[PDB]
């Protein structure tokens, strides 16, 4: 029979008022003999009717993928509202239901600290700029780097780690040619998270 998977909005979509967050209900293993799928959606128990079905997609393995998308309000999501997708289909003895929401719990403000390259790293062709982000809850976040308004893309960020006080931390490392560091370029770590003022902070880093 068919199976269902429900997926949250992207963190960035829920935190930028200029973007459009949505939740997605994916039905896989839809049969050729019974392709018709019905979706009901509910928000904190109350049925909403503004979902929209994506084009049907046939798969390599002779079954359909059917997808419903529901737009959501930044604040509903961030306030922890619960979104339920219910799926009905002839090849189902009984409808399937799935629910998702933000993680439960008091949100906590990330502390953002920038850390220069170790003196010992100064012999290398390239050096590491660290952005430490700690004490934040829930774990939904975005970290990006830039210099003079342009995005610096040569970075990697660790997954969030659960800390001993029940908040999360992570580190972002950006790698630059030592000469760019020597030339006094200012680099900036940008963090977006719900419990920040205007959802956004930015910390800078330059040769001292």
């Amino acid at each position: 029979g068919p199976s269902v998977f429900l997926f949250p909005p992207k963190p960035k979509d829920t935190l930028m008022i200029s973007r459009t967050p949505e939740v997605t209900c994916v039905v896989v293993d839809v049969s050729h003999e019974d392709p018709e799928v019905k979706f009901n959606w509910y928000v904190d128990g109350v049925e909403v009717h503004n979902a929209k079905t994506k084009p049907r997609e046939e798969q390599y393995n002779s079954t359909y993928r059917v997808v419903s998308v529901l737009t959501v309000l930044h604040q509903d999501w961030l306030n922890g509202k619960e979104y339920k997708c219910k799926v009905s289909n002839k090849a189902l003895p009984a409808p399937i239901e799935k629910t998702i929401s933000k993680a439960k719990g008091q949100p906590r403000e990330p502390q953002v600290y920038t850390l220069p390259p170790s003196r010992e790293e100064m012999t290398k062709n390239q050096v590491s700029l660290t952005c430490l982000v700690k004490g934040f809850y829930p774990s939904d976040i975005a970290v990006e780097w830039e210099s003079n308004g342009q995005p610096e893309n040569n970075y990697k960020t660790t997954p969030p780690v659960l800390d001993s006080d029940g908040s999360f931390w992570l580190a972002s490392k950006l790698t630059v040619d030592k000469s760019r560091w020597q030339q006094g370029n200012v680099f900036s770590c940008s963090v977006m998270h719900e419990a920040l003022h205007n959802h956004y902070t930015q910390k800078s880093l330059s040769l001292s």
Binding site: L15, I17, E144, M192, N198, H199
Partner: peptide, 13 residues
């Protein structure tokens, strides 16, 4: 006040 990211609007309080 308002916050922008690479010229794109984030949030205003």
């Amino acid at each position: 006040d308002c916050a922008w990211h690479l010229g794109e609007l984030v949030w205003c309080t």
